[PDB]
Each structure stands twice: as structure tokens, then as C-alpha cells.
Ligand binder design. Structure first.
Ligand SMILES: [Mg+2]
Ligand SMILES: [Mg+2]
Ligand SMILES: [Mg+2]
Ligand SMILES: [Mg+2]
Ligand SMILES: [Mg+2]
Ligand SMILES: [Mg+2]
Ligand SMILES: [Mg+2]
Ligand SMILES: [Mg+2]
Ligand SMILES: [Mg+2]
Ligand SMILES: [Mg+2]
Ligand SMILES: [Mg+2]
Ligand SMILES: [Mg+2]
Ligand SMILES: [Mg+2]
Ligand SMILES: [Mg+2]
Ligand SMILES: [Mg+2]
Ligand SMILES: [Mg+2]
Ligand SMILES: [Mg+2]
Ligand SMILES: [Mg+2]
Ligand SMILES: [Mg+2]
Ligand SMILES: [Mg+2]
Ligand SMILES: [Mg+2]
Ligand SMILES: [Mg+2]
Ligand SMILES: [Mg+2]
Ligand SMILES: [Mg+2]
Ligand SMILES: [Mg+2]
Ligand SMILES: [Mg+2]
Ligand SMILES: [Mg+2]
Ligand SMILES: [Mg+2]
Ligand SMILES: [Mg+2]
Ligand SMILES: [Mg+2]
Ligand SMILES: [Mg+2]
Ligand SMILES: [Mg+2]
Ligand SMILES: [Mg+2]
Ligand SMILES: [Mg+2]
Ligand SMILES: [Mg+2]
Ligand SMILES: [Mg+2]
Ligand SMILES: [Mg+2]
Ligand SMILES: [Mg+2]
Ligand SMILES: [Mg+2]
Ligand SMILES: [Mg+2]
Ligand SMILES: [Mg+2]
Ligand SMILES: [Mg+2]
Ligand SMILES: [Mg+2]
Ligand SMILES: [Mg+2]
Ligand SMILES: [Mg+2]
Ligand SMILES: [Mg+2]
Ligand SMILES: [Mg+2]
Ligand SMILES: [Mg+2]
Ligand SMILES: [Mg+2]
Ligand SMILES: [Mg+2]
Lengths: 85, 200, 113
RNA sequence: UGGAGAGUUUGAUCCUGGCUCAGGACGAACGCUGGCGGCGUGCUUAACACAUGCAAGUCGAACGGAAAGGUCUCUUCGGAGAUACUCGAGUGGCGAACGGGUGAGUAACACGUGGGUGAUCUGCCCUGCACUUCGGGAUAAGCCUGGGAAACUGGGUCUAAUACCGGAUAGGACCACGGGAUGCAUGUCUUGUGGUGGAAAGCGCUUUAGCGGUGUGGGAUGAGCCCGCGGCCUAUCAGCUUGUUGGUGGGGUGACGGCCUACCAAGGCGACGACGGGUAGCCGGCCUGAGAGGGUGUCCGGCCACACUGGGACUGAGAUACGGCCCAGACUCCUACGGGAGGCAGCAGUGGGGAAUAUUGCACAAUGGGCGCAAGCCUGAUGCAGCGACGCCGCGUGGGGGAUGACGGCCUUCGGGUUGUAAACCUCUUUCACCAUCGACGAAGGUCCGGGUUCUCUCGGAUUGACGGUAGGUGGAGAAGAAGCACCGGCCAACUACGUGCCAGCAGCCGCGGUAAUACGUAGGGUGCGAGCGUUGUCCGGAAUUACUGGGCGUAAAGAGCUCGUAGGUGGUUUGUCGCGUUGUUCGUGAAAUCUCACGGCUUAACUGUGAGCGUGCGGGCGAUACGGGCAGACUAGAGU
């Protein structure tokens, strides 16, 4: 780069990418684990991995990683998979 | 630019004495040149061109300035030949001529141009100032005890002062009552042919 | 956010101005959201007019005035009647009323007779 | 409140009908000429390649620290002492998505206009209500070291926070079941119970310095998405489409949605121009015109698109991310040959192309923006200046007298005529330049220090203006320093002489020149303009020669060889009704600027401010029903039997 602040921001755009990618990948390997218990027709772990998957989504939305209307769209979809099993 | 040339030469071509009284005119009232006495062809464009030339060299107004006077004469209500001579008359060098403070039109132009006049206590030196209603035209306090200004003192009787302006006493200051309509305008020219010139 | 700023729209040596409500992310002579006044800093006092029932609407809703418009709302009194200060009346002053064009003309006719 | 014509077909005429000209305009160019000021304006071609400087930072009142300066020091006489205002590098917050440039791409919801969002987002700003609570682990810098030619980079120790991570409590997150309000089908807003959940942070203080943090109800501003109607040429482009058109279950998104995916149905567009080809940024506006129309999109202002070419995500409230990242391509440059560096369509500037378009200028004083409590720092935005008659506007280059109507030139019928009151001469006045001198308004502000009840505020001062010793005022000297260009046969204002002899040459048309040329070359004279005047290029007019306003078709260009019929256009008499067309009225909108009107301010004017019209339209509510049309009937004159 050329501007003094632009070398500063390139170092912080990569710290923020490694921070946010670890949080988004934690959400994909926690929604997926709910999809295993929901597809087996368990209703035992599926009633209590829902309570730990929605709690990880709201923490990822308060940290600025995903948007709040995205967290509401994923909690509404996992809860309607529970009530149909 | 000004014309700055012979003044009888453009009073002979137009067949009309433009300045006030001339002895070089009326000895030769025909147009100048080596072909001066020939029979001219009376066109319709010639009657419309030379009538506009009667209005330019009576007032000393160039063509790109006389055309802008036509562009607002046709745009005001009333008539067009009336309001053309109205805004030509309100030029400040024409005010000095009609008030009897100058001999001819070309010295009434200089006395405004050399800065011998105020209007509302404001030092003007443009000949194309258009005086409105209720304007005073005052002379500078410095420019008294001056040769062309003292010659305009005793000679305040030989030419008529029009009714749209008024001259007062020991302060030679001109009071403008209203803009002149038609009747107090001196007529060496007819007015409808200038309107018909620009229609071409 | 929403600013109350000036807009230069005069000649080269005559900087006329308008008091205009606009966003901060806008050039000077852009689209104003609403024009509420004017400011001509070439007369002998000045020529200042603020609408004073629209400058109370925009201050109540969150428009931050800039630092030369803030000096104008304190003069006209629209800032003091918003923050509740005791300088709520307008302390602006107008130019001297000149004797009119008809009056000087009648004074000159009587000066000769 | 506003419309002009002329030449040319013939021996002559009247129509038809082309061609040509006079008018206006310009981002201009070229030719000759050139005094000044005001005010606008200046790469239209190569979105071609770019040397050098600058165009985006800021905060010590977030944090560790001490490289520079000033102080407190010990004291060498040129080294030590973070403790300490101030501060390089670094962490962290915010900014950098604004501002500035360009018109390559796009015939499209890109733009103009009017709606929809019960389908959405919105940092900083304003306001209502709660809250601001316990802990933890590291790292940059520093220091010690390894690799590399450089650009840069690996490792070990070490230190903070408003950096980061984990808990407690907090409804506008979710799920289930209910009430109460409304409608436009999905529904929407407001409440209740049960079950699940989501936050943060402190720093400063002359001792009523002060700035922040987080969750949420509501405003303001900005933005996304969808739809109606509107603005190019081409049918010598007539069959385009398979995630294509629709449904359901999931996925995705800020949000609706084939936006994506799996299955199922077999659709969707098109002669009212689909699919294709050519071209083009769009608009307010600008030029022309009597208007209707026609050409255009340049300054200024709104919006869109792009940043060496092509693609792609990341960070964030917000991204075509111009002065960011990654990859590939072309082209410059360094290298020790392993590898690296760059993108002026930012402001000036150079090369190139070209008929042709400028300075590597000053200032942050004014206004706008970013950060900071603030003082301030930053700002080639901007305010100005330099240059070019490039355009519009204004003023000068003298004025009043002046006949023996001179000399000279030109013409002559040889008497004179003409240039010509024009010069000579007498005389008056200094605008602009020129010399000397005084000297701004833009600043009811920006700062410091006195008086203030705090906020605020003035008695009133120190100081602060790039333009600028400029504009403007005053004083001096003398007509003193200051005119050209085209045209003169008709159109179209303005004519004679000499040279020339179908030659040299002229010209927009048709024509001129072959020994008396008002048309070629020169001189005299004249006309039109005048710091300009002409030529060429381009558009509108004249052209009622694309005709809606406003034309034609027996013989001038023009009726299909003739009928039948599809889409379409059009429709007799009469009753009732709806109120789509039409029409009345009113509110919302039609930004500002430009434009017409009226006043006001620059000495006038251009220019500029204010007020009103304009904005031909479009949407919502309420009136009218004559006519057109839709709906439900009646009638026999048209038509058929
Ligand atoms: Mg920083
Ligand atoms: Mg994994
Ligand atoms: Mg969903
Ligand atoms: Mg001029
Ligand atoms: Mg014939
Ligand atoms: Mg003939
Ligand atoms: Mg020259
Ligand atoms: Mg260009
Ligand atoms: Mg620092
Ligand atoms: Mg801050
Ligand atoms: Mg940008
Ligand atoms: Mg530690
Ligand atoms: Mg909890
Ligand atoms: Mg926490
Ligand atoms: Mg499929
Ligand atoms: Mg769905
Ligand atoms: Mg679907
Ligand atoms: Mg193009
Ligand atoms: Mg016409
Ligand atoms: Mg443009
Ligand atoms: Mg341009
Ligand atoms: Mg380039
Ligand atoms: Mg994001
Ligand atoms: Mg950037
Ligand atoms: Mg650049
Ligand atoms: Mg440049
Ligand atoms: Mg060249
Ligand atoms: Mg500044
Ligand atoms: Mg400022
Ligand atoms: Mg000039
Ligand atoms: Mg030239
Ligand atoms: Mg003087
Ligand atoms: Mg003639
Ligand atoms: Mg001859
Ligand atoms: Mg000749
Ligand atoms: Mg031409
Ligand atoms: Mg026409
Ligand atoms: Mg034409
Ligand atoms: Mg015809
Ligand atoms: Mg017929
Ligand atoms: Mg025939
Ligand atoms: Mg025929
Ligand atoms: Mg027939
Ligand atoms: Mg047929
Ligand atoms: Mg019909
Ligand atoms: Mg009918
Ligand atoms: Mg308007
Ligand atoms: Mg005036
Ligand atoms: Mg105006
Ligand atoms: Mg209506």
C-alpha cells in the first residue's frame, strides 16, 4: 500500500478475518450436530442440543460476526425441525 | 468603440440632418462619394436599414448594443417602437443633451464619460446609464468653475427643455419626472421601420 | 449526521449564502433537504434571516449546526429558545433605514422653490 | 404579444418540384489585425503510455512506553536520571465507502416521473426507559537472535488497555397456546402465561474541569428491493427459451423472490416487433423555431457506471474499495537470477495523437468535510491568482468651433467634381492607460488575555486576509500612449478608372473573363460592422421539401390486376345504469440553478439576490353525465333472409 493508515488496516483486516472465520465455523459444526439428532428421530438430545445451538447463535450475533436477522432465521428453522419430530 | 469620424458624412447618406443645425449640410443634401448625385434605387430593405442608421448615429450606439435594446423593447408590453425610443432616451448622455448642458451629442457623451456627473451622489462615468424615475443628475463639486460648464449657464434658453425632465437654478442638477412616452421625443425618424428591420 | 450548514452561491467577489439543512456526506452545493434561511455578509451590518419555526423543528430532532451557523442562531435567538437560555429574544440588528427615493425627489423640488 | 422571402427548367407563361443563399448558435479551428477592464470558460481525438512533487489522516482526556525538543537533576565535559508537561515508531478507537476525476460499458428499472415496502436495513446525531456486574489468558512494541541481494520474514523471552475471550442478571431473539384492536390475501401492531436465550469500559480533574460504555421503545437522515407510464435506428434479424414459466419441502439473504437445490406439473414470451444486429451514459437543461416539433446532453446541479484488462472475496453501519488485499494476463523497472516493485480517467505537468485546448502557482483567511473535550492538526474539496480576444458585456483611441471650401491622390464632358469640417489652425476636457500617494469590504468570526451569576455575554483591547499594496478614492502632466477587417452584378446595404484578353484567375447558386469587365488584379471612392472582422466544419430555421398543428395521388413522383377474409381501426335510432376516457375543484408532488415577469445590489451592463409565474404531467379525496366507451334491455330506416 501507500498510505500510512492503509498498512495499519491491512494488518487488522486479517486479524478480524481469522477471528470471524473461527466463529462462523463453530456455528456450522453445531447446527450440523443438531441435524444428526433431529434426523435420527431422537427427541432426547434434539431437545437439548437445540438449547445449546441457539445459545451459540445469539452469542455470535452479539459479537458482530453474523447479523441479528440471520440468527433469528436460523433459530426459527431449527426449532421448527424439533416440533415436527 | 466609438465612431470618431466625420459627422456630416452620415447626415448626408441618410438624407437627414442628425445633429442640431449644420451649415455643411444643406449645401450638399445628397449622399457623399464620387457617385454622390446618382439616382438611388428605392428598395424596401434600404428604407428599413437607413431608418435604423438614423437611430444609431443620432445616439452614438453600436450595433451589438442597439440590438440588445431591441431584444427588450419587443419583450416589454405596450408597443415596440415606443419603448425602443424610451430606453434610448433614458441614456445619461441623452439626458445631458436635452437638459441643455452640452452643444452636440458627442460632447454630452464626453462630459458623462470623463466623470463630471453624479446621480445619487454616485460617481458615474458610463454613457449608457439608464436613469429611472426620480433620479437626480447632479454635477461634480470639483467640476464647477470649468469652461464647458460655465458656457452651459447663460445658454439655457435657445433650445427647449422637454417636459419629462426639469432643470433648476444655481446648482445645475437635473430632476427626472418620468420616462418619456412619445410626444416630448424629438422626431427626425419614424419608429415602425426599425421594428420591421429586425423582422427580416 | 444531519447538519445545518451554509451554501456558497454568489458571484466571485460576492459570497452570498443560504442556511440549508443537509447531510454531512454531501458537497456544499448539493441537494439541501430544506432551505430555511440566508446570510449575506457584504452589507454594513449583515443580511440575516432565519425562518425560526423551521430552525426549531430541525434542532429538536437532532441536526447539529456547524460552527459559523451556531453563531447565527445565537444572534437571531433561535438557539437560546431551544436550550432555554435567557437571551431568548433576538439580538440581531438591521441596517439604517435610508430615506426613500420619493422623499429625496420632493426634497429637491422644495429646495428650488 | 406572435409566422417576411430571393435566384434558377422555357422564346415566353402558369403549376409541380429539387438544388442554393440571406438569419441565429458554438467547449471551437484557421486567416489578417490587436488597447483595456468586468465575468464566464478552456484535451470534443488515444478509457493511449506516464518521469517528479503533492491529493487522508487524526487523538497522550484508550494503553505500554521514552527515539526528538523543553525542564528537574548527578555531573563526564559531552554521559547518566519516565519520576516529568510534550512526543518518533507501535497497539487500540473512529475516519479512510465522503470529497475529487472520467464517459469505456449499459437499450437495462440505468434514467425521468408517480407509487408500493403487511418484504427491509440505517454508524455518528436527538429523545424516552433500564443498566454500567464478577473473572481469565495472551500479544504488538521493547530486548536477544536466525534466514534473504533486496522487498521482507521465522523463532525465543517480555508488557499493557476502551484489544481479545469466558460467567451472573436484563422481553422487543426463537417456539407453543391465548386475549384485545384493526384489513389488502400472505397478515400487521399491541398485550398475557409457560418453555428457551443474548450485553459493556473505563479515563480525566486548578477540586459544580469533564468526555465516554451497553441493551432497548421512538424520531431524523441515508440506502436497498419491486411495479405503472415515458424517451433511439433496423424485419435484407421470424421462432426464442429447459432453472426456462409455475408449485411444494428445504437451503440462502438485511429483505421478497428459481436467488440456489431436489422432485413434480408443461409451461413463459412474440407481428402492440420476442430473439438478434448498429449506436448511445440518462436527466434538469442548452441551441433553433411563431408555436408544434427538430438537433444536442458541453459549464453548473441530480443520478448511474468504471479506476492498467478480466474475475474474486475480505474488513465494516455503509464497498465499482481510484491513491486496499489475493490470483491470472499485457506492459514498464530493480536483481546477487532464488525472487521482487508499479498503475495520474485526483491537482499541476511531460511524451504521443491531433485542425485544437493552459501553471510542475498561492492560501487554509472564508465556506464544507475527517478526527479530538478542546487549543489545534489534516484537506490540489474549496477560495483565488497565472495563461489563451475562446465567448458574452462595458469603455476608450478625443471634443466645440473651423473655408481661401488648401496641398496631395483619384475622376473629368478639362468649366470642375470628390475625398471634405475631414485635415491645417485656434481652443476645451483627462475617462482609461502612465507617475506619485492613501488604502479596503469579504470577519456582528478565529484565537488569546480584562469585565462575566455557570451555560451565555458584552464595556473594550492585543492580534488574525491567500487574493494585495489589488479594487477604489485623491494629486500630477499634456491630444497626449491606442484601428482594423470583410464586402461593393442580382439575392443584399455599397461604382468608377486603369492593367488583363477564355489567359491569369473568380464563385454559395446561375454565371463572369474571347481588346472599352460596375463580377478577375490594383488604386480612388463607398457600404456594413468595429477590438474585432471574415472563411471552413456542425445543428435548427427559411423547407407547408415527412405536412399532428400543416401536403398529396385522372395526365406532374404516387390507387395494389381484381376480389375474399384474420388480427386491428370504425359504427345507425332509443331507455336505464356504472363514472374507465372527458371535465370541474382541492391537498401531496413537479429540488436548486437556467428561463419569462417585478423590484433590489455590484459606477452601468453582463453577472447576482429575493418574490411570483412556469413545471403541458402524475398520484389520493370529493362533484358533473352532454359525448366516447363498458354492462343489462328495447326498436326497424343500414345489413341479411
Ligand atoms: Mg491508526
Ligand atoms: Mg471444522
Ligand atoms: Mg428460514
Ligand atoms: Mg463589444
Ligand atoms: Mg422542360
Ligand atoms: Mg433563360
Ligand atoms: Mg499574432
Ligand atoms: Mg476525453
Ligand atoms: Mg504518537
Ligand atoms: Mg472517540
Ligand atoms: Mg469513491
Ligand atoms: Mg500480562
Ligand atoms: Mg442468561
Ligand atoms: Mg463481557
Ligand atoms: Mg432442477
Ligand atoms: Mg421458502
Ligand atoms: Mg422453492
Ligand atoms: Mg460509448
Ligand atoms: Mg417553422
Ligand atoms: Mg456530464
Ligand atoms: Mg469534460
Ligand atoms: Mg490509462
Ligand atoms: Mg459483513
Ligand atoms: Mg481507499
Ligand atoms: Mg492513482
Ligand atoms: Mg491530469
Ligand atoms: Mg502534433
Ligand atoms: Mg480552511
Ligand atoms: Mg472549518
Ligand atoms: Mg479579454
Ligand atoms: Mg484567432
Ligand atoms: Mg485619476
Ligand atoms: Mg444594391
Ligand atoms: Mg477595360
Ligand atoms: Mg474587382
Ligand atoms: Mg457554413
Ligand atoms: Mg418541418
Ligand atoms: Mg438546410
Ligand atoms: Mg407536395
Ligand atoms: Mg382519393
Ligand atoms: Mg409520363
Ligand atoms: Mg405518373
Ligand atoms: Mg383499378
Ligand atoms: Mg394485401
Ligand atoms: Mg369495437
Ligand atoms: Mg354511437
Ligand atoms: Mg425550478
Ligand atoms: Mg440598477
Ligand atoms: Mg436570476
Ligand atoms: Mg386529480
Amino acid at each position: 500500500a501507500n498510505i500510512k493508515s492503509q498498512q495499519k488496516r491491512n494488518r487488522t483486516n486479517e486479524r478480524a478475518r481469522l477471528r470471524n472465520k473461527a466463529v462462523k465455523s463453530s456455528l456450522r459444526t453445531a447446527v450440523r450436530a443438531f441435524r444428526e439428532a433431529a434426523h435420527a428421530g431422537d427427541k432426547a438430545k434434539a431437545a437439548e442440543l437445540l438449547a445449546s445451538t441457539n445459545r451459540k447463535l445469539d452469542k455470535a450475533a452479539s459479537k458482530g460476526v453474523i447479523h441479528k436477522n440471520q440468527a433469528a432465521n436460523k433459530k426459527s428453522a431449527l426449532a421448527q425441525a424439533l416440533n415436527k419430530l | 468603440a466609438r465612431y470618431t469620424g466625420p459627422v456630416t458624412r452620415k447626415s448626408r447618406r441618410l438624407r437627414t440632418d442628425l445633429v442640431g443645425g449644420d451649415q455643411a449640410f444643406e449645401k450638399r443634401p445628397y449622399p457623399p462619394g464620387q457617385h454622390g448625385r446618382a439616382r438611388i434605387k428605392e428598395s424596401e430593405y434600404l428604407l428599413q436599414l437607413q431608418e435604423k442608421q438614423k437611430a444609431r448615429f443620432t445616439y452614438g450606439v453600436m450595433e451589438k448594443q442597439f440590438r440588445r435594446y431591441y431584444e427588450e423593447a419587443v419583450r416589454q408590453p405596450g408597443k415596440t417602437g415606443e419603448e425602443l425610443l424610451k430606453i434610448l432616451e433614458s441614456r445619461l448622455d441623452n439626458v445631458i443633451y436635452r437638459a441643455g448642458l452640452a452643444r452636440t451629442r458627442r460632447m454630452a457623451r464626453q462630459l458623462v464619460s470623463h466623470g463630471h456627473f453624479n446621480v445619487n451622489g454616485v460617481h458615474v462615468n458610463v454613457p449608457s446609464y439608464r436613469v429611472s424615475q426620480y433620479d437626480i443628475v447632479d454635477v461634480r463639486d470639483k467640476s464647477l468653475n470649468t469652461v464647458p460648464f460655465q458656457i452651459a449657464r447663460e445658454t439655457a434658453g435657445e433650445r427647449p427643455i422637454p417636459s419629462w425632465l426639469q432643470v433648476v437654478g444655481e446648482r445645475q442638477r437635473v430632476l427626472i419626472h418620468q420616462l418619456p412616452e412619445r410626444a416630448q421625443i424629438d422626431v427626425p425618424l419614424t419608429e415602425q421601420l426599425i421594428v420591421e428591420y429586425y423582422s427580416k | 449526521a444531519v447538519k445545518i450548514k451554509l451554501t456558497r452561491l454568489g458571484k466571485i467577489r460576492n459570497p452570498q449564502y443560504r442556511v440549508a439543512v443537509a447531510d454531512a456526506r454531501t458537497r456544499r452545493d448539493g441537494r439541501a433537504i430544506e432551505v430555511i434561511g440566508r446570510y449575506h455578509p457584504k452589507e454594513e451590518p449583515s443580511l440575516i434571516e432565519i425562518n425560526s419555526e423551521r430552525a426549531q423543528y430541525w434542532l429538536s430532532v437532532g441536526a447539529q449546526p456547524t460552527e459559523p451557523v451556531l453563531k447565527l442562531l445565537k444572534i437571531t435567538g433561535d438557539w437560546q429558545k431551544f436550550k432555554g437560555l435567557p437571551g431568548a429574544q433576538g439580538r440581531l440588528k438591521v441596517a439604517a433605514p435610508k430615506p426613500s427615493k420619493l422623499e429625496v425627489f420632493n426634497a429637491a423640488l422644495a429646495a428650488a422653490d
